[PDB]
Amino acid sequence: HGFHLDILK
Amino acid sequence: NATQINEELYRLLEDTEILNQEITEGLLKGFEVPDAGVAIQLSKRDVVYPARILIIVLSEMWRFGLTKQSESFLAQVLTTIQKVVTQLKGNDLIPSGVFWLANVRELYSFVVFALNSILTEETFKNGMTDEEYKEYVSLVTELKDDFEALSYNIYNIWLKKLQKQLQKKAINAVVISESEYTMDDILTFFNSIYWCMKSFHIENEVFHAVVTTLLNYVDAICFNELIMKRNFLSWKRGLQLNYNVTRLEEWCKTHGLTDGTECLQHLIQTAKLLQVRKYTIEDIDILRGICYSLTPAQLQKLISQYQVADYESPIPQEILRYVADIVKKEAALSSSSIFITPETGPFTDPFSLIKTRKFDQVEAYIPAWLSLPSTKRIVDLVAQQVVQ
């Protein structure tokens, strides 16, 4: 499934 | 198109034989520290740029579940970053060392943000296996510990190296110099450190920590040179010493440091001793009060090596007997050296005492002078994807 972070503009 | 975009990203990330080669050689070893002066102004984007890049790469590796790759990726980054710091010598010791302290801190801030996110946000725990979750939480946590162990390491390595550069210049410019090193060279050494930490957006607490450490060291190594100096400690010498330390005090004052005097007391009280009256017993009592950082065994050693000028009258045997008399009583209480053991490490990482930089979203950016084919392609791909 993975590990998704929101880190970009 | 989104299907083809994500497909290209995977192939680029899965091959951590090319990526590890680009990062280590082109980014970590091929690093170019910008001019460490506030002549030109540096934004954060130009200071922690390798850290911002390593974050994006690592972020995507975590997004496509490439745990096997991201582990070996960073396990080399740590080893390579620390390898560079240890290999630092010469005119690059200060700017390059600070440069990596900023990046490691930037990297450490993200891993803290990641670990704090995976434990607080339920979308992570709800959207993956109980096995997968226990793997990531253990993966990121192990990574965080390794990063704070990296900052702690590269700080000590860098700080122990700074002290080595000082000792070559500190002793001769404080003990010998009289207004082949001068006090100008010493203050230049500190000007370098000051301007670097200001240009690289370093928190002023680290600047305070570094200078404080170095000041106490100069205070120690110079005092240990003086107390062994014979036919040297004169009134004129004591006045010359006070001026040198004064310049150090005035530098700390004008550069946002208020505890500089506290760090140089052994030198200051040595200068005061070589100037104040020492004729009668009455004088020695006042001397013990002024020299509160010194011990009877140190006062005795300092006074007995005092250089009386051609005109000046020597210190009476009545005084010397009185001084040694006090030393007798002091030694009995402890039921023993005259030197000061300099703090040569290990040191507490100053960054570990300041809140981690509250991570916000990163702008997809990479310098044009850099040559990282695969690494740039990744960043460009995520840029298009973000818009989509």
Closest Cα in chain B, distance from residue A2 (Å): 4
In sequence order, which residues have a C-beta less than 8 Å from that of residue B354 and are 6 or more positions away?
B203, B205, B206
Residue B190: which H helix or E strand, with range? helix B183-199
Q: Are B294 and B269 in contact (CB under 8 A)?
A: yes
> Considering only alpha carbons, which residue of chain B is nearest residue A7?
B361
B118 interface with A at CB cutoff 8 Å: yes
Q: State how far the Cα of B296 lies from the Cα of B288, in Å rounded to an integer.
A: 8
List the single residue in A1, A4, A7 with the smallest CB-CB distance to B55: A7
Q: Is B345 left (phi over 0), alpha (psi -120 to 50) or beta?
A: left
Residues in B touching A3 (Cβ below 8 Å): 62-63, 65, 118, 124, 128, 136
| Residues in a beta bridge with B306 | B233
Buried b (16+ CB within 10 A) or exposed e, B23-48: bbebbbeebebeebeeeeebeeeebb
Q: State how far the Cα of B157 lies from the Cα of B163, in Å rounded to an integer.
A: 10
Q: Is B233 helix (H, G, I), strand (E, B) or coil?
A: strand
Q: What is the DSSP letter of B359?
A: -
Q: Which of B112, B117, B243, B114 is nearest to B173 (CA)?
A: B243
How many alpha carbons fall within 13 Å on the CB side of residue B105? 25
Evaluated on CA atoms B199, B201, B206, B208, the torsion sign reads positive
**Backbone phi, psi, residue B306, to 5°:** -75, 130
Evaluated on CA atoms B171, B344, B108, B96, the torsion sign reads positive
B76 interface with A at CB cutoff 8 Å: no
Q: State how far the Cα of B5 lies from the Cα of B355, in Å rounded to an integer.
A: 37
Q: State how far the Cα of B29 lies from the Cα of B202, in Å rounded to an integer.
A: 22
Q: Are B216 and B268 in contact (CB under 8 A)?
A: no
Pick among A1, A6, A7 to test the B interface (most B CBs inside 10 A) = A7
Q: State how far the Cα of B235 lies from the Cα of B257, in Å rounded to an integer.
A: 29
Burial (Cβ within 10 Å: 0-12, 13-18, ≥19) of residue B11: exposed
CB atoms within 10 A of CB B277: 10
Resolution (A): 2.9
Q: Is B66 helix (H, G, I), strand (E, B) or coil?
A: coil
Q: Which amino acid appears at position B104 of this protein?
A: V
What DSSP string runs through B291-315?
Answer: --SS-HHHHHHHHTTEE--SSSPPP
CB contact under 8 A, A5 and B117: yes
Closest Cα in chain B, distance from residue A6 (Å): 7
- At CB < 8 A and 24+ separation, what contacts does B141-150 make? B141/B115, B143/B74, B143/B111, B144/B108, B144/B111, B144/B112, B144/B115, B146/B74, B146/B78, B147/B78, B147/B104, B147/B107, B147/B108, B147/B111, B148/B108, B148/B349, B148/B352, B150/B78, B150/B81, B150/B82, B150/B104, B150/B108
Q: Which of B218, B212, B228, B154 is nearest to B185 (CA)?
A: B218
Q: Which of B282, B275, B94 is nearest to B192 (CA)?
A: B94
List the single residue in B132, B136, B361 with the smallest CB-CB distance to A8: B361
